[PDB]
Amino acid sequence: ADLEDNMETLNDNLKVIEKADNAAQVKDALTKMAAAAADAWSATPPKLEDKSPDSPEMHDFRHGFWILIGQIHDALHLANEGKVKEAQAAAEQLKCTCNACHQKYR
Amino acid sequence: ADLEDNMETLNDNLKVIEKADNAAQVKDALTKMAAAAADAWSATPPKLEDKSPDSPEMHDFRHGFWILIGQIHDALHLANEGKVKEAQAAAEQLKCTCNACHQKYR
Amino acid sequence: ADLEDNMETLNDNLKVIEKADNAAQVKDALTKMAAAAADAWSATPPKLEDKSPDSPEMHDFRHGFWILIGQIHDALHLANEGKVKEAQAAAEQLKCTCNACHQKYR
Amino acid sequence: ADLEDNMETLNDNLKVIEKADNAAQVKDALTKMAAAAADAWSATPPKLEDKSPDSPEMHDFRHGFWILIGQIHDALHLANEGKVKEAQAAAEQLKCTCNACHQKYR
Numbered sequence: 284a285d286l287e288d289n290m291e292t293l294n295d296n297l298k299v300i301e302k303a304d305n306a307a308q309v310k311d312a313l314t315k316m317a318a319a320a321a322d323a324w325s326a327t328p329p330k331l332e333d334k335s336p337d338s339p340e341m342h343d344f345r346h347g348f349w350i351l352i353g354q355i356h357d358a359l360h361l362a363n364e365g366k367v368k369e370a371q372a373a374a375e376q377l378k379c380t381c382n383a384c385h386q387k388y389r
Numbered sequence: 390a391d392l393e394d395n396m397e398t399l400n401d402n403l404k405v406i407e408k409a410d411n412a413a414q415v416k417d418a419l420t421k422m423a424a425a426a427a428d429a430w431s432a433t434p435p436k437l438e439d440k441s442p443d444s445p446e447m448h449d450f451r452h453g454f455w456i457l458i459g460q461i462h463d464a465l466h467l468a469n470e471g472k473v474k475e476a477q478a479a480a481e482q483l484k485c486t487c488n489a490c491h492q493k494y495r
Numbered sequence: 496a497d498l499e500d501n502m503e504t505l506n507d508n509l510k511v512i513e514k515a516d517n518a519a520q521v522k523d524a525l526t527k528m529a530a531a532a533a534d535a536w537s538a539t540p541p542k543l544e545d546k547s548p549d550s551p552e553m554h555d556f557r558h559g560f561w562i563l564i565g566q567i568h569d570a571l572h573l574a575n576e577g578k579v580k581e582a583q584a585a586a587e588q589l590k591c592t593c594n595a596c597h598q599k600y601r
Numbered sequence: 602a603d604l605e606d607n608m609e610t611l612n613d614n615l616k617v618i619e620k621a622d623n624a625a626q627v628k629d630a631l632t633k634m635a636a637a638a639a640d641a642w643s644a645t646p647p648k649l650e651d652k653s654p655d656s657p658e659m660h661d662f663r664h665g666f667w668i669l670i671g672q673i674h675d676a677l678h679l680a681n682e683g684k685v686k687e688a689q690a691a692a693e694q695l696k697c698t699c700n701a702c703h704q705k706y707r
């Protein structure tokens with residue numbers, strides 16, 4: 284659905300990964316994050332409402348999702364390999380991307 | 390919207406890139422493809438209708454979109470640098486990904 | 496060592512993947528390709544000997560190795576998950592990048 | 602050459618990026634970092650000397666370099682586009698990867 288709901292599922296599932304005991308829990312959480320990130324692709328954030336869909340800001344905004352999506356992808360492979368700690372570490376590294384976009388556009 | 394519509398916009402814009410004379414045309418077409426690929430993320434193809442969203446087939450199906458999205462991302466950077474020929478070559482390389490998914494799931 | 500030798504190991508191991516019966520064989524081959532691709536990074540091809548290391552051609556040449564390295568990395572994740580067929584398909588998709596560089600610079 | 606020398610050039614060039622006033626400076630520094638990261642690929646860190654090259658630790662160590670290499674690649678596209686501030690931000694995000702590997706293996 285909307286940007287806020289997608290952001291909520293990203294946040295909820297990042298916390299799930301942080302507290303996870305097994306690979307299945309991490310895999311499920313990352314799958315849901317992948318779907319939320321993909322669904323958020325086309326959203327226009329409130330702070331960029333006055334800007335063109337083709338503006339440098341909107342391109343940069345969408346670029347952040349490219350980065351997040353790529354990171355979720357790789358973290359899911361690590362989880363699929365049963366590498367819980369490695370996948371959790373990869374999910375922690377996702378935060379740098381979360382935080383970078385929030386700093387600019389939230 | 391639906392899978393078929395997203396595939397049409399992928400195909401339309403790939404052709405635009407092949408026939409393009411300037412970077413602006415390639416940039417615009419790749420941007421459209423990126424949106425279409427992200428929107429297609431969550432779709433269930435007709436041939437996998439009987440399968441679980443968590444089946445090996447559906448994970449592999451979605452994985453192909455991860456690959457496509459990554460390739461579109463890189464091609465847009467080359468287009469942004471004004472490297473028309475390089476971006477066109479990158480777009481041609483996308484076809485390997487198109488064809489690979491079609492052969493399995495179309 | 497030298498570009499030719501790295502290319503030999505890339506080609507040899509690609510063929511090993513094609514003929515492989517299990518994931519261990521694919522994993523081993525892809526690990527060898529990863530090392531060869533990384534070692535090839537800083538090589539200057541005969542056809543670009545007259546060009547500056549900072550030339551558009553040399554940047555483009557190195558870029559092709561980034562692409563190849565990224566694809567080997569993902570294919571190895573698939574092999575690590577025991578997805579032999581998927582990893583073999585991924586390795587087949589590597590050829591598009593092999594061929595693209597050879598057409599321009601070999 | 603050796604791991605320590607590669608780390609020095611990574612560190613020196615990261616600082617250059619942080620203090621840079623032009624895209625050319627950032628481009629040059631990122632190119633050097635890419636070469637150093639590629640060269641570090643096959644190194645065995647002192648803390649993993651008693652481990653097999655096929656150990657989980659060595660796989661994870663090498664994985665960190667793939668991640669770094671991917672991020673340097675993206676950052677260089679941004680610099681090539683003349684987006685100094687975006688490239689500098691991308692280089693800052695590299696630190697997350699530097700720091701993550703150091704915490705585990707330094």
Ligand code: HEM
Pocket residue numbers: 286287290291293294295297328329344345346347348351377378380381382384385388389
């Ligand atoms: C896993 C990574 C991420 C997490 C955990 C996350 C989490 C959140 C949370 C909890 C909110 C607040 C929702 C609310 O109550 O209003 C939010 C808002 C927001 N996020 Fe993220 N986020 C992530 C990645 C990103 C990325 C990559 C972008 C941009 C590329 C982004 C852009 C935004 C924007 C623009 C808002 C404000 C939404 C609004 O006001 O409607 N986020 N995020």
Ligand code: HEM
Pocket residue numbers: 392393396397399400403434435450451452453454457483484486487488490491494495
């Ligand atoms: C740029 C690359 C691609 C192009 C140019 C392309 C093009 C097309 C076209 C023209 C159609 C027929 C649409 C119609 O009239 O019904 C189609 C269908 C389809 N494509 Fe793609 N495609 C691409 C990428 C992909 C990828 C990466 C996947 C899988 C991950 C995929 C999966 C499918 C499926 C499952 C259908 C069947 C849709 C249906 O019958 O309802 N495509 N594609």
Ligand code: HEM
Pocket residue numbers: 498499500502503505506509540541556557558559560563589590592593594596597600601
């Ligand atoms: C997995 C894919 C690849 C395969 C199977 C492959 C295989 C080969 C083979 C069989 C040769 C000729 C044999 C030799 O002289 O050693 C060669 C040479 C060469 N390759 Fe590739 N290669 C691959 C990837 C690449 C990529 C991505 C690039 C560009 C970035 C590239 C650039 C070159 C160049 C410039 C030569 C000529 C070197 C010379 O003759 O001194 N190759 N490779």
Ligand code: HEM
Pocket residue numbers: 604605606608609611612615646647662663664665666669695696698699700702703706707
């Ligand atoms: C751009 C990111 C990075 C920067 C700026 C950086 C910088 C440094 C510096 C300044 C040192 C101390 C000098 C030395 O003794 O080598 C060092 C050491 C080291 N780094 Fe990094 N590094 C980065 C990335 C990484 C990554 C990704 C890994 C692992 C995947 C890693 C593993 C190590 C190890 C094992 C040492 C200790 C080796 C030794 O000195 O005996 N570094 N790094």
Ligand SMILES: [Zn+2]
Pocket residue numbers: 357360568572664667
């Ligand atoms: Zn990975």
Ligand SMILES: [Zn+2]
Pocket residue numbers: 463466558561674678
């Ligand atoms: Zn690129």
Ligand SMILES: [Zn+2]
Pocket residue numbers: 356360452455569572
């Ligand atoms: Zn993958």
Ligand SMILES: [Zn+2]
Pocket residue numbers: 346349462466675678
């Ligand atoms: Zn990018």
